[PDB]
Amino acid sequence: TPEEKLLRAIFGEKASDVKDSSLRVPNGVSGTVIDVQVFTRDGVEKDKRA
Amino acid sequence: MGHIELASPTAHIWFLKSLPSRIGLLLDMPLRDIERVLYFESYVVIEGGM
Amino acid sequence: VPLDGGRFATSDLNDLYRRVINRNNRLKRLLDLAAPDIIVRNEKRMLQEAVDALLDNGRRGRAITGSNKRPLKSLADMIKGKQGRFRQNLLGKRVDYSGR
Amino acid sequence: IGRTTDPVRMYMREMGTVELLTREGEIDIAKRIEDGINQVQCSVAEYPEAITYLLEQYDRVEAEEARLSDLITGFVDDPELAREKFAELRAQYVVTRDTIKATAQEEILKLSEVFKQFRLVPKQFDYLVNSMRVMMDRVRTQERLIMKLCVEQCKMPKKNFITLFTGNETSDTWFNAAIAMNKPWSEKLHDVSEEVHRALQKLQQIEEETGLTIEQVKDINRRMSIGEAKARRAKKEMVEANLRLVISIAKKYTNRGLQFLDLIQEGNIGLMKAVDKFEYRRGYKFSTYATWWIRQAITRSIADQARTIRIPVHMIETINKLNRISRQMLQEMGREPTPEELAERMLMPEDKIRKVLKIAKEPISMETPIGDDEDSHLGDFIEDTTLELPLDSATTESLRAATHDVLAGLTAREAKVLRMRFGIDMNTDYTLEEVGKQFDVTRERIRQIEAKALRKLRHPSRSEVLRSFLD
């Protein structure tokens, strides 16, 4: 919107091309992560943790 | 809303099959005959002149 | 609506409208071709069937849907009945600022 | 008939009534078609000015502004031969128009017999038939209105109309002879004598350009209608006979996304196409030829109008090949084929393999019942993602307030510059040149003012209200 345009002009705030989607813990549940599993399709580069 | 142009004038099921068939009694003709006509089982003589 | 996972979800009215339009266009073509009476009569019957299935599906051979064996829901089904409307969504809403 | 509403059953009865024509009946009806088309062919040859357009567009084709195959698709008992025959056609026609004043009847017959060898791509048949039909329409409306003028007011018998108007159709003798009959409506005819006679003149103009008269134009065109209708009736009988073949082929493609009757209707259309294009000169049974169309039509219809989200026909063929290959690989390998194994067996790079695998999914119905619960469907879960969250609306309002206050904090003309350079409280924002036009001073100084105002907004304690909206 215009007004945000002006704010960016003044402060020079480079807009991030990425939205957040991270899987955060549900509200009001708290415990210890005991196990993690990672499934990559065949072809894709396994990450270090994988 | 949009609309569709029908090639053949089509009957409105509500005004035909509703238990008191209002097309039927408006024309004072029993339902069996009207069904017979719409499904192309018999003709009807509309103003057969002299 | 496109469901997460590349699949799509559609109301049955899309199917019913599509079928009506298909049979209508085919009847147009058949008329332009001057086909024998038997064929145009069959097509006119089919268009009757499609329309009356659209308005209130269930007062005929109950045109079931594609590969799902459940009879698809027509407009009359949307209005009438408990699950459909007046009862469900216009006297039975779901408020905000509420807890349990 | 037990009032069976099922449309399948009544269509089946109507079909069941027409009995199966035997082996030779088929050849008979095919001869019927040839004879009707031949009759109309002679009739079209017998009409004039058609050759005019033939010659004209063949000449057009010689100049190379068109194609040689747009008029003929091979003759029966090379462009050069056609060119010479069209030259002799021009010559014979013009000389017969000169010799019109008896012998010209024989000369037109010779023109027709020399033209007989040619055939004509359907589109031109359509053009000529529509031209003569529209001429007949026009003549028929004029004649019918004249005949109305006579009978509706005078109760005029009809042999007299025939003799007076029919026979000449060219001289004005009958118009004024009708008035000589002392009849009162004939005396009133002077009111529309102008129009009647001007339409007669138009009739003479069409006649002369065609180079004939009317009564025989009526005769020829009505014979054309007789021949064409006869042939059509024969074709009707044929197709009614072969509807059974249509159903037989149709029963194969069962519930594959198309209502049974849609299939049989598409098959009927394909059978019509086959019948109209069939050539018996081979000898082999029509059914063999018609099938190759019935299956074609059914497959095409399934290809296009089956899926909700339509997919091109070549893509459907690709998916079917996919399924086939998969089937074979499963039965050989035992386990299943992975996309790599398919990319082996098929030549695509496996990128298009996963593309094709994604494409095929049909949309799921939003009414499908959710697990073990018949009062909660799927539609009740999908949410509306477009809707802006109320938080964001409150934020936008607060920001509008803050920017209004900070703009008021600036000077008048600086504030107007900053408002117009952007769109605050206005439509599209004007560039430096247009804002200069608004001030009528158009140059870089104005960009200096915008930047200077911005610099002034850098100053702390004034911008903090806007610093807050960052996050």
XYZ file of C-alpha atoms in Angstrom:
671
model
C 0.000 0.000 0.000
C 1.119 3.628 -0.584
C 1.855 4.439 3.048
C 4.083 1.389 3.388
C 5.754 2.548 0.151
C 6.584 5.837 1.853
C 7.852 4.057 4.949
C 10.175 1.923 2.823
C 11.371 5.028 1.003
C 12.296 6.692 4.288
C 13.802 3.723 6.121
C 14.936 1.553 3.198
C 13.531 -1.768 4.464
C 14.372 -4.477 1.916
C 11.258 -6.653 1.663
C 11.931 -10.317 2.371
C 10.811 -12.587 -0.475
C 10.047 -15.458 1.960
C 7.006 -16.197 4.124
C 7.350 -18.136 7.359
C 5.874 -21.617 7.684
C 7.966 -23.283 10.394
C 6.304 -26.057 12.394
C 6.113 -24.552 15.867
C 4.938 -26.422 18.952
C 1.160 -26.336 19.538
C -0.068 -23.840 22.093
C 0.059 -24.933 25.715
C 1.836 -28.279 25.279
C 5.403 -28.621 26.545
C 7.699 -31.628 26.590
C 11.006 -33.029 25.412
C 11.701 -33.963 21.798
C 12.635 -37.638 22.084
C 12.922 -38.574 18.420
C 13.174 -37.146 14.912
C 12.825 -38.769 11.495
C 13.576 -37.351 8.050
C 12.150 -38.612 4.745
C 13.652 -37.250 1.526
C 12.347 -38.160 -1.898
C 14.724 -40.019 -4.173
C 16.697 -37.452 -6.144
C 16.730 -34.578 -3.668
C 19.914 -33.720 -1.784
C 19.806 -35.162 1.724
C 20.499 -32.452 4.262
C 23.349 -32.734 6.734
C 20.953 -33.775 9.496
C 19.464 -36.438 7.246
C -24.789 -14.674 -11.906
C -24.652 -16.165 -15.390
C -27.111 -17.870 -17.695
C -27.350 -20.725 -20.200
C -29.474 -20.543 -23.354
C -31.378 -23.802 -23.750
C -32.108 -24.935 -27.282
C -35.264 -26.850 -26.345
C -37.680 -25.236 -23.863
C -37.496 -27.410 -20.751
C -39.976 -27.992 -17.940
C -39.349 -26.895 -14.358
C -39.479 -30.071 -12.287
C -40.796 -28.291 -9.196
C -43.955 -27.060 -10.912
C -44.595 -30.460 -12.515
C -43.755 -33.192 -9.993
C -44.780 -31.407 -6.802
C -47.399 -33.713 -5.327
C -50.216 -31.372 -6.501
C -48.961 -30.967 -10.053
C -49.697 -27.326 -10.745
C -49.070 -27.547 -14.480
C -51.365 -30.547 -14.359
C -54.412 -29.031 -12.720
C -53.827 -25.587 -14.244
C -54.354 -27.316 -17.596
C -56.851 -29.695 -15.925
C -55.017 -32.656 -17.430
C -53.893 -35.655 -15.344
C -50.211 -36.099 -14.580
C -49.867 -39.461 -16.321
C -50.626 -37.808 -19.668
C -48.226 -34.905 -19.141
C -45.441 -37.325 -18.274
C -46.406 -39.307 -21.370
C -45.987 -36.173 -23.478
C -42.741 -34.801 -22.052
C -41.023 -38.157 -22.487
C -42.143 -38.225 -26.119
C -44.626 -41.095 -25.757
C -47.689 -39.352 -27.238
C -48.707 -36.179 -29.055
C -51.223 -33.543 -28.002
C -53.585 -31.642 -30.319
C -53.182 -27.919 -29.607
C -55.987 -26.027 -31.367
C -56.738 -28.456 -34.155
C -58.888 -25.966 -36.025
C -62.172 -27.001 -37.629
C -10.615 -24.878 -4.083
C -7.110 -26.377 -4.484
C -6.430 -28.657 -1.530
C -2.919 -28.718 -0.105
C -1.329 -31.617 -1.953
C -2.091 -30.769 -5.563
C -5.634 -32.143 -5.449
C -8.773 -30.061 -5.925
C -12.155 -30.051 -4.192
C -15.338 -29.091 -6.045
C -19.043 -28.918 -5.339
C -21.295 -31.256 -7.266
C -22.999 -28.310 -8.938
C -19.899 -27.993 -11.101
C -20.559 -31.519 -12.347
C -24.255 -30.915 -12.900
C -23.740 -27.646 -14.774
C -21.037 -29.262 -16.902
C -23.333 -32.117 -17.852
C -26.174 -29.749 -18.748
C -23.875 -27.616 -20.901
C -22.467 -30.682 -22.644
C -25.874 -32.044 -23.581
C -27.052 -28.585 -24.639
C -24.110 -28.042 -26.978
C -24.505 -31.523 -28.418
C -28.169 -30.809 -29.113
C -27.194 -27.598 -30.885
C -24.763 -29.498 -33.094
C -27.298 -32.238 -33.793
C -29.873 -29.668 -34.849
C -27.374 -28.019 -37.174
C -26.751 -31.459 -38.720
C -30.477 -32.212 -39.210
C -30.168 -35.658 -37.656
C -33.079 -38.125 -37.805
C -35.917 -37.592 -35.370
C -35.005 -40.511 -33.113
C -31.660 -38.991 -32.187
C -32.919 -35.467 -31.493
C -35.739 -36.922 -29.412
C -33.249 -38.895 -27.339
C -31.108 -35.791 -26.887
C -34.092 -33.700 -25.802
C -35.003 -36.342 -23.240
C -31.437 -36.322 -21.949
C -31.471 -32.547 -21.584
C -34.721 -32.819 -19.644
C -33.061 -35.379 -17.392
C -29.998 -33.216 -16.814
C -31.957 -30.075 -15.976
C -34.355 -31.819 -13.620
C -31.405 -33.513 -11.922
C -29.875 -30.065 -11.515
C -32.919 -28.480 -9.910
C -33.899 -31.370 -7.612
C -31.905 -34.585 -8.020
C -33.776 -37.588 -6.654
C -37.185 -37.558 -8.341
C -35.836 -39.642 -11.269
C -33.122 -42.246 -11.769
C -30.999 -40.362 -9.209
C -27.973 -39.377 -11.265
C -25.051 -40.465 -9.072
C -21.632 -38.815 -9.332
C -18.325 -39.802 -10.923
C -16.734 -42.858 -9.294
C -18.245 -41.910 -5.952
C -21.326 -44.065 -5.449
C -23.136 -41.369 -3.421
C -25.941 -39.373 -5.096
C -24.739 -35.828 -5.702
C -26.393 -32.839 -4.022
C -28.551 -30.500 -6.109
C -29.741 -27.000 -5.203
C -32.989 -28.227 -3.681
C -30.829 -30.429 -1.468
C -28.825 -27.378 -0.406
C -31.901 -25.439 0.684
C -34.187 -28.166 2.034
C -33.399 -30.471 4.913
C -31.709 -30.207 8.286
C -28.051 -30.456 7.309
C -28.472 -28.086 4.371
C -29.491 -24.545 5.192
C -32.199 -22.538 7.023
C -31.952 -24.960 9.922
C -28.183 -25.359 9.730
C -26.652 -22.009 8.741
C -29.387 -19.409 9.349
C -30.662 -20.378 12.795
C -27.642 -22.361 13.977
C -24.578 -20.223 13.396
C -21.205 -20.579 15.161
C -20.320 -17.507 17.182
C -16.903 -16.040 17.958
C -15.581 -15.068 21.404
C -16.753 -18.395 22.802
C -15.198 -21.218 24.787
C -15.926 -24.603 26.322
C -45.669 -49.413 -22.274
C -45.504 -49.458 -18.487
C -44.795 -45.742 -18.003
C -41.123 -46.651 -17.506
C -39.519 -43.264 -16.891
C -35.994 -44.620 -17.438
C -34.920 -42.846 -20.654
C -32.625 -45.759 -21.461
C -35.606 -48.074 -21.721
C -37.678 -45.915 -24.050
C -34.727 -45.150 -26.294
C -34.100 -48.882 -26.420
C -37.701 -49.544 -27.478
C -37.695 -46.927 -30.239
C -34.448 -48.424 -31.482
C -35.848 -51.954 -31.174
C -38.730 -51.197 -33.516
C -36.610 -50.673 -36.644
C -35.742 -54.146 -37.922
C -32.337 -55.112 -39.315
C -32.037 -54.590 -43.077
C -30.449 -57.548 -44.842
C -27.210 -57.692 -46.824
C -28.542 -56.443 -50.176
C -30.828 -53.819 -48.651
C -27.651 -51.982 -47.685
C -26.457 -51.897 -51.296
C -29.932 -50.776 -52.336
C -29.923 -47.817 -49.961
C -26.413 -46.891 -51.027
C -27.620 -46.824 -54.628
C -30.436 -44.604 -53.403
C -27.845 -42.146 -52.089
C -25.839 -42.197 -55.323
C -28.974 -41.682 -57.402
C -30.149 -38.728 -55.330
C -26.747 -37.049 -55.378
C -26.503 -37.727 -59.115
C -29.897 -36.122 -59.735
C -28.879 -33.024 -57.806
C -25.560 -33.061 -59.692
C -27.321 -32.927 -63.047
C -29.617 -30.196 -61.742
C -26.706 -28.048 -60.528
C -25.029 -28.531 -63.895
C -28.282 -27.363 -65.511
C -28.193 -24.034 -63.682
C -26.205 -21.046 -65.011
C -23.923 -18.436 -63.430
C -22.578 -21.258 -61.253
C -19.937 -21.805 -63.914
C -19.310 -18.076 -63.649
C -18.049 -18.438 -60.072
C -16.287 -21.694 -60.980
C -14.326 -19.970 -63.746
C -13.693 -16.928 -61.564
C -12.195 -18.787 -58.615
C -10.297 -21.226 -60.819
C -8.699 -18.211 -62.496
C -8.018 -16.858 -59.009
C -6.249 -20.168 -58.292
C -4.173 -19.859 -61.487
C -2.925 -16.421 -60.444
C -1.821 -18.361 -57.292
C -3.758 -16.266 -54.762
C -5.353 -19.508 -53.497
C -4.892 -23.295 -53.672
C -5.522 -25.751 -56.489
C -7.133 -28.234 -54.080
C -9.798 -25.827 -52.781
C -12.088 -26.611 -55.740
C -11.295 -30.200 -56.750
C -9.771 -33.197 -54.954
C -8.944 -35.234 -58.044
C -11.225 -35.675 -61.054
C -12.779 -38.795 -62.623
C -12.440 -39.738 -66.319
C -3.861 -32.207 -63.545
C -4.339 -28.420 -63.416
C -3.519 -27.884 -67.107
C -6.476 -29.966 -68.286
C -8.789 -28.077 -65.956
C -7.400 -24.759 -67.226
C -8.106 -25.660 -70.852
C -11.574 -27.004 -70.012
C -12.318 -23.750 -68.177
C -11.147 -21.759 -71.214
C -13.549 -23.675 -73.448
C -16.196 -23.144 -70.780
C -15.786 -19.358 -70.950
C -15.928 -19.534 -74.740
C -19.013 -21.753 -74.932
C -20.865 -19.725 -72.307
C -20.240 -16.319 -73.883
C -21.104 -17.617 -77.351
C -24.305 -19.191 -76.039
C -25.219 -15.886 -74.434
C -24.711 -14.237 -77.816
C -26.770 -16.958 -79.571
C -29.413 -16.886 -76.795
C -31.934 -15.699 -79.391
C -33.625 -22.080 -79.651
C -30.021 -22.932 -80.583
C -28.778 -21.602 -77.248
C -30.697 -24.406 -75.513
C -28.503 -26.940 -77.307
C -25.412 -24.835 -76.639
C -26.166 -24.737 -72.897
C -26.709 -28.495 -72.980
C -23.278 -28.883 -74.590
C -21.769 -26.662 -71.899
C -23.355 -28.848 -69.241
C -22.085 -32.071 -70.817
C -18.522 -30.762 -71.132
C -18.611 -29.561 -67.522
C -19.972 -32.923 -66.292
C -16.467 -34.350 -65.814
C -15.609 -31.889 -63.044
C -16.260 -32.370 -59.337
C -16.335 -29.640 -56.707
C -15.016 -29.547 -53.122
C -18.010 -29.388 -50.723
C -17.548 -25.747 -49.669
C -18.342 -24.461 -53.146
C -21.320 -26.801 -53.337
C -22.520 -25.064 -50.200
C -21.920 -21.621 -51.685
C -23.844 -22.386 -54.877
C -26.723 -24.191 -53.162
C -27.115 -21.340 -50.706
C -27.091 -18.769 -53.495
C -29.846 -20.590 -55.360
C -31.780 -21.248 -52.150
C -31.710 -17.572 -51.211
C -32.808 -16.643 -54.714
C -35.693 -19.094 -54.320
C -36.497 -17.630 -50.907
C -36.684 -14.137 -52.378
C -38.775 -15.241 -55.397
C -41.075 -17.229 -53.114
C -41.718 -14.324 -50.766
C -42.524 -11.955 -53.634
C -44.765 -14.487 -55.386
C -46.550 -15.429 -52.168
C -47.236 -11.786 -51.293
C -48.637 -11.150 -54.800
C -50.826 -14.234 -54.528
C -51.944 -12.948 -51.125
C -52.819 -9.585 -52.678
C -55.079 -11.463 -55.054
C -56.819 -14.093 -52.932
C -57.128 -12.507 -49.489
C -59.056 -9.475 -50.784
C -60.649 -10.770 -54.014
C -61.188 -14.499 -53.405
C -59.492 -14.803 -56.791
C -59.358 -18.261 -58.388
C -55.940 -19.532 -59.313
C -55.721 -20.883 -62.871
C -56.061 -17.237 -63.908
C -53.183 -16.131 -61.691
C -51.038 -18.902 -63.198
C -51.778 -17.955 -66.807
C -51.430 -14.217 -66.194
C -48.211 -14.240 -64.169
C -46.850 -17.693 -65.008
C -45.725 -18.465 -68.543
C -44.005 -15.157 -69.231
C -42.931 -13.863 -65.790
C -41.212 -11.062 -67.748
C -43.622 -8.760 -69.569
C -45.955 -6.298 -67.853
C -48.913 -7.405 -70.002
C -50.464 -9.524 -67.233
C -50.391 -6.750 -64.638
C -52.502 -4.358 -66.697
C -54.544 -7.195 -68.230
C -55.637 -8.036 -64.685
C -56.882 -4.453 -64.395
C -58.548 -4.857 -67.788
C -60.563 -7.695 -66.213
C -62.389 -4.821 -64.418
C -61.803 -6.366 -61.000
C -61.675 -3.829 -58.140
C -58.524 -5.113 -56.462
C -56.826 -4.963 -59.843
C -57.771 -1.285 -60.004
C -56.297 -0.699 -56.539
C -53.080 -2.459 -57.642
C -51.814 0.867 -59.008
C -50.989 1.726 -55.389
C -48.212 -0.898 -55.365
C -47.655 -1.148 -59.109
C -44.260 0.479 -58.586
C -43.030 -2.121 -56.095
C -44.487 -5.138 -57.910
C -42.919 -4.097 -61.204
C -39.568 -3.133 -59.645
C -39.375 -6.588 -58.083
C -40.232 -7.990 -61.515
C -37.320 -5.955 -62.912
C -35.024 -7.425 -60.265
C -36.286 -10.836 -61.344
C -35.348 -9.993 -64.925
C -31.924 -8.773 -63.796
C -31.232 -12.031 -61.963
C -32.570 -13.893 -65.005
C -30.344 -12.074 -67.495
C -27.208 -12.385 -65.371
C -28.077 -16.069 -64.986
C -29.298 -16.005 -68.601
C -32.549 -17.939 -68.145
C -36.161 -17.440 -66.995
C -38.138 -18.375 -63.850
C -40.594 -21.251 -64.400
C -37.661 -23.473 -65.342
C -35.596 -22.142 -62.415
C -38.486 -23.199 -60.197
C -38.604 -26.583 -61.931
C -34.859 -27.209 -61.564
C -34.597 -26.106 -57.940
C -37.665 -28.093 -56.934
C -36.149 -31.190 -58.551
C -32.994 -30.460 -56.557
C -35.086 -30.417 -53.389
C -36.739 -33.694 -54.421
C -33.422 -35.422 -55.055
C -31.767 -34.137 -51.896
C -34.737 -35.038 -49.698
C -34.992 -38.502 -51.246
C -31.299 -39.083 -50.535
C -31.660 -37.787 -46.980
C -34.546 -40.180 -46.373
C -32.368 -43.053 -47.561
C -29.592 -42.007 -45.181
C -32.120 -41.771 -42.358
C -33.134 -45.382 -42.969
C -29.496 -46.479 -43.017
C -28.567 -44.834 -39.719
C -31.728 -46.124 -38.057
C -30.637 -49.572 -39.192
C -27.123 -49.280 -37.747
C -27.998 -47.815 -34.345
C -27.569 -51.383 -33.061
C -23.938 -51.340 -34.129
C -23.606 -48.034 -32.305
C -24.836 -49.549 -29.037
C -22.690 -52.641 -29.479
C -19.538 -50.565 -29.727
C -20.775 -48.218 -26.987
C -21.280 -50.879 -24.309
C -17.498 -51.243 -24.146
C -16.676 -47.826 -22.692
C -18.824 -48.134 -19.565
C -18.710 -45.927 -16.496
C -15.433 -44.183 -17.347
C -16.716 -40.690 -16.525
C -19.449 -40.400 -19.197
C -23.111 -41.237 -18.836
C -23.958 -44.261 -20.976
C -26.322 -42.236 -23.144
C -23.738 -39.525 -23.793
C -21.596 -42.315 -25.219
C -24.365 -43.676 -27.420
C -25.164 -40.157 -28.643
C -21.559 -39.491 -29.613
C -21.608 -42.845 -31.365
C -24.726 -41.811 -33.248
C -22.951 -38.668 -34.441
C -19.964 -40.703 -35.560
C -22.241 -43.084 -37.432
C -23.858 -40.145 -39.225
C -20.410 -38.965 -40.261
C -19.473 -42.433 -41.496
C -22.677 -42.948 -43.476
C -22.364 -39.598 -45.219
C -18.699 -40.266 -46.098
C -18.979 -43.990 -46.929
C -18.050 -45.330 -50.379
C -19.511 -48.747 -51.274
C -17.346 -49.167 -54.398
C -15.083 -51.388 -52.308
C -17.527 -54.201 -51.616
C -16.832 -54.732 -47.944
C -19.533 -54.381 -45.282
C -20.345 -50.841 -44.179
C -20.065 -51.878 -40.528
C -16.304 -52.254 -40.901
C -16.069 -48.657 -42.093
C -18.544 -47.270 -39.553
C -16.803 -48.826 -36.548
C -13.544 -47.074 -37.378
C -15.557 -43.867 -36.807
C -17.733 -44.940 -33.882
C -14.775 -45.883 -31.715
C -13.020 -42.718 -32.886
C -15.896 -40.467 -31.826
C -16.442 -42.164 -28.471
C -12.746 -41.908 -27.648
C -12.619 -38.248 -28.682
C -15.603 -37.381 -26.508
C -14.165 -39.180 -23.496
C -10.897 -37.383 -24.184
C -12.385 -33.903 -24.146
C -15.598 -33.718 -22.093
C -14.886 -36.414 -19.480
C -12.573 -34.736 -16.975
C -13.640 -31.728 -14.937
C -10.308 -30.013 -15.591
C -9.912 -30.692 -19.300
C -6.640 -32.142 -20.587
C -5.395 -32.147 -24.215
C -5.948 -35.371 -26.120
C -2.259 -36.102 -26.637
C -1.791 -35.872 -22.872
C -4.543 -38.444 -22.411
C -2.744 -40.716 -24.858
C 0.438 -40.226 -22.847
C -1.338 -41.172 -19.615
C -2.831 -44.272 -21.228
C 0.587 -45.338 -22.501
C 1.803 -44.747 -18.951
C -0.844 -47.055 -17.514
C -0.110 -49.747 -20.106
C 3.640 -49.716 -19.463
C 3.018 -49.717 -15.706
C 0.763 -52.766 -16.030
C 3.373 -54.719 -17.960
C 6.236 -53.724 -15.668
C 4.161 -54.743 -12.658
C 3.412 -58.181 -14.038
C 7.025 -58.797 -15.096
C 8.821 -57.241 -12.120
C 6.274 -58.486 -9.588
C 6.667 -55.502 -7.267
C 5.829 -52.239 -9.092
C 7.558 -49.762 -11.469
C 9.346 -46.770 -9.945
C 9.460 -43.589 -12.079
C 13.135 -44.279 -12.804
C 12.212 -47.675 -14.236
C 9.531 -46.013 -16.349
C 12.010 -43.426 -17.629
C 14.039 -46.473 -18.622
C 11.174 -48.205 -20.424
C 9.769 -44.958 -21.839
C 11.915 -42.344 -23.568
C 10.785 -39.251 -21.625
C 13.376 -37.791 -19.207
C 11.323 -38.700 -16.068
C 10.729 -35.012 -15.399
C 7.666 -35.304 -17.605
C 6.941 -38.631 -15.943
C 6.319 -36.991 -12.579
C 4.537 -34.141 -14.343
C 2.114 -36.616 -15.932
C 1.715 -38.416 -12.621
C 0.654 -35.182 -10.918
C -1.659 -34.027 -13.716
C -4.081 -36.942 -13.699
C -5.846 -36.427 -10.364
C -9.578 -35.684 -10.682
C -10.988 -33.229 -8.090
C -12.527 -34.751 -4.971
C -16.130 -33.854 -4.161
C -16.438 -31.513 -1.161
C -19.462 -33.488 0.048
C -17.565 -36.748 0.555
C -18.392 -37.834 4.134
C -15.551 -37.591 6.614
C -14.563 -40.761 8.450
C -17.242 -42.560 10.481
C -19.424 -39.467 10.653
C -22.396 -38.853 8.342
C -23.152 -35.320 9.593
C -19.742 -33.716 8.919
C -18.570 -33.459 5.313
C -15.371 -32.096 3.794
C -16.673 -28.674 2.799
C -17.017 -27.880 6.500
C -13.209 -27.904 6.878
C -11.679 -25.940 3.993
C -11.084 -22.362 5.118
C -11.032 -19.045 3.277
C -7.377 -18.033 2.994
C -7.810 -14.696 1.182
C -9.554 -12.967 4.094
C -7.344 -10.353 5.741
C -6.908 -10.793 9.478
C -8.561 -8.073 11.612
C -5.236 -7.378 13.314
C -3.856 -6.213 9.980
C -6.837 -3.905 9.477
C -6.312 -2.286 12.873
C -2.621 -1.916 12.044
C -3.405 -0.282 8.711
C -5.766 2.178 10.383
C -3.231 3.105 13.057
C -0.590 3.561 10.364
C -2.902 5.811 8.362
C -3.385 7.952 11.461
C 0.335 8.169 12.157
C 1.241 9.069 8.585
C -1.477 11.724 8.547
C -0.064 13.279 11.699
C 3.515 13.194 10.446
C 2.500 14.683 7.093
C 0.738 17.456 9.001
C 4.058 17.857 10.809
C 5.694 18.931 7.544
C 5.305 22.211 5.680
C 2.357 22.832 3.373
C 4.052 22.569 -0.015
C 6.424 19.835 1.149
C 3.422 17.885 2.421
C 1.617 18.299 -0.898
C 4.742 17.138 -2.736
C 5.065 14.073 -0.529
C 1.357 13.255 -0.773
C 1.295 13.535 -4.569
C 4.613 11.798 -5.226
C 2.912 8.843 -3.511
C -0.778 7.996 -3.295
C -1.704 9.072 0.229
C -5.400 10.032 0.161
C -5.331 10.233 -3.650
C -5.431 8.070 -6.758
C -2.352 7.072 -8.782
C 0.822 8.802 -7.661
C 2.327 11.354 -10.019
C 5.961 11.227 -11.099
C 8.333 14.149 -10.629
C 7.438 15.546 -14.055
C 3.685 15.470 -13.420
C 3.995 16.944 -9.922
C 6.091 19.665 -11.520
C 3.256 20.200 -13.988
C 0.968 20.519 -10.984
C 3.385 23.151 -9.696
C 4.197 24.014 -13.372
C 7.926 23.977 -12.452
C 9.229 20.664 -13.917
C 12.848 19.596 -13.183
C 15.155 17.826 -10.686
C 14.797 20.483 -7.951
C 11.577 18.683 -7.048
C 13.368 15.407 -6.486
C 15.663 17.482 -4.299
C 12.631 18.605 -2.269
C 11.278 15.073 -1.898
C 14.656 13.818 -0.710
C 15.025 16.823 1.593
C 11.645 16.095 3.173
C 12.660 12.470 3.644
C 15.887 13.647 5.282
C 13.746 15.755 7.596
C 11.839 12.592 8.472
C 15.137 10.979 9.455
C 15.227 13.408 12.385
C 14.474 11.527 15.633
C 11.472 12.270 17.839
C 9.405 13.029 14.725
C 9.685 9.650 12.967
C 9.551 7.440 16.101
C 5.810 7.135 15.635
C 6.575 5.611 12.263
C 9.622 3.692 13.552
C 7.195 1.760 15.746
C 5.369 0.173 12.815
C 8.520 -1.646 11.732
C 8.915 -5.190 13.018
